[PDB]
Amino acid sequence: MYLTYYFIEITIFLAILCTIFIISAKNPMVSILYMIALFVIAAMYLYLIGLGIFSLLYIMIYIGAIAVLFLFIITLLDINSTELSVKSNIRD
């Protein structure tokens, strides 16, 4: 029954992981796909804390409109993008 205890710290670790996959990706669509993953990890946390209403509002407008908006923009536009190479980003 105490398998069901660490549920918050789990989603915290998953959010850390998910932003690491935001800022390290090849395509510009792979980053927004991990971003909608980040919204749904957030909405799981918001249900978890005791706010069932918000989680579904976050699904309605954050993997709702603004997701579709960003996916849409990245489709009908060309955007050059380099990779996370060590020779251009170890200086940071």
Partner: protein, 179 residues
């Protein structure tokens, strides 16, 4: 009265602070630049900044605590001597003597002007008009700073100015009286 300073303790604290400032400035210089740079050129094409942040931070507070200890008081002059030492560190980067002398004089004068006003970038809460007794005095009170009276006591002005020039402990006409 006062308390003497630990010159070695304050100097090694400032040495650690100057180290941290040199590290964060070299990290800033890598990223705010152009051309081929990597992890190792943090201290290769650093422009020599960590020596600046280290040497100024040691020399200012060492000269400051040493001057405040050998003079046995705290005023704006200690900031003058410490800013002269800081100008000596910042003047040695350009390897020329009249440059160096100018840095030591002018940075020391600017730091002495900073120290004489209160050595603060902000204000003192007390000891300023909004939070200090001002206006006239009410009775025979000791006239503090910020206050005006109509006639100072003569025994006070003879202590302050002197007993020489024209000022005397008795006015000159009643000093020459017929009895």
């Amino acid at each position: 009265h006062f308390h003497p300073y630990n010159t070695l303790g304050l100097a090694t604290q400032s040495a650690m602070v100057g180290l941290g400032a040199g590290v964060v400035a070299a990290a800033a210089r890598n990223s705010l630049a152009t051309g081929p740079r990597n992890i190792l050129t943090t201290f290769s094409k650093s422009g020599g900044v960590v020596t600046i942040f280290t040497g100024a931070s040691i020399a200012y507070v060492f000269t400051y605590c040493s001057a405040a200890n050998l003079r046995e008081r705290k005023d704006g002059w200690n900031h003058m001597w410490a800013g002269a030492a800081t100008g000596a560190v910042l003047g040695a980067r350009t390897k020329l003597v009249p440059a160096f002398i100018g840095w030591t004089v002018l940075c020391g004068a600017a730091c002495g002007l900073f120290g004489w006003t209160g050595a603060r970038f902000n204000a003192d809460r007390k000891a300023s008009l909004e939070q200090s007794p001002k206006g006239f005095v009410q009775e025979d009170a000791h006239q503090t700073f910020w206050e005006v009276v109509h006639r100072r006591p003569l025994s006070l002005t003879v202590e302050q100015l002197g007993e020489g020039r024209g000022i005397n402990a008795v006015p000159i006409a009643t000093a020459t009286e017929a009895p």
